[PDB]
């Protein structure tokens, strides 16, 4: 579990979005596993605007932050689950690291701010949904 709080927006994994999130929807993309809902209180996260491929992510199943090297946002095949059928997830970045079901929502950050959130996991791999191209998150 986990979310990004930037301005009056809440960014979560689309598969973990609540009843309240859909009623307060701003934008969602099933192919990216992202949903953005509106908030009443202002958030304090800053989104990175960069092409960093190194950063640190929070792993809830280990209660630890791990430094990682990660791939550029890409269209990656993701096995069928209870949330989505087998499909191509876009804007996904992979790294060699621990991830388990329950770790989605953990933030990945670089020196410029928030890069993205944990969205997928494999045998020794972790996948992050990138948010750096969502320029509108900084305005209104
Ligand atoms: C955070 O790692 C989860 C994980 C680790 C290790 C094995 C399996 C998973 C679950 C998994 O990858 N998915 C289930 C939830 C929706 C995800 C999606 N974005 O399509 C895919
Ligand atoms: Zn950066």
From Swiss-Prot:
It catalyses: Selective cleavage of Tyr-|-Gly bond in the picornavirus polyprotein. It comes from the Viruses. Zn(2+) 1 binds at residues 50, 52, 110, 112. The active site is at 15 (for protease 2a activity), 33 (for protease 2a activity), 104 (for protease 2a activity). Homodimer. Cysteine protease that cleaves viral polyprotein and specific host proteins. It is responsible for the autocatalytic cleavage between the P1 and P2 regions, which is the first cleavage occurring in the polyprotein. Also cleaves the host translation initiation factor EIF4G1, in order to shut down the capped cellular mRNA translation. Inhibits the host nucleus-cytoplasm protein and RNA trafficking by cleaving host members of the nuclear pores. Counteracts stress granule formation probably by antagonizing its assembly or promoting its dissassembly. This is Protease 2A. It comes from Coxsackievirus A16 (strain G-10). The chain holds residues 869 to 1008 of 2193 of the full protein.
């Amino acid at each position: 579990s986990g979310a990004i709080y930037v301005g009056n927006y809440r960014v979560v994994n689309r598969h973990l979005a609540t009843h309240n999130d859909w009623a307060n929807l701003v934008w969602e993309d099933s192919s990216r596993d992202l949903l953005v809902s509106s908030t009443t209180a202002q958030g304090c996260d800053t989104i990175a605007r960069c092409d960093c491929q190194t950063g640190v992510y929070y792993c809830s199943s280990r209660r630890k932050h791990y430094p990682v090297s990660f791939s550029k946002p890409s269209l990656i095949f993701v096995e069928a689950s209870e949330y989505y059928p087998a499909r191509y997830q876009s804007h996904l970045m992979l790294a060699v690291g621990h991830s388990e079901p329950g770790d989605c929502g953990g933030i990945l950050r670089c020196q410029h701010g928030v890069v993205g959130i944990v969205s997928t996991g494999g045998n020794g791999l972790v996948g992050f949904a990138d948010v750096r191209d969502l320029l509108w998150l900084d305005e209104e």
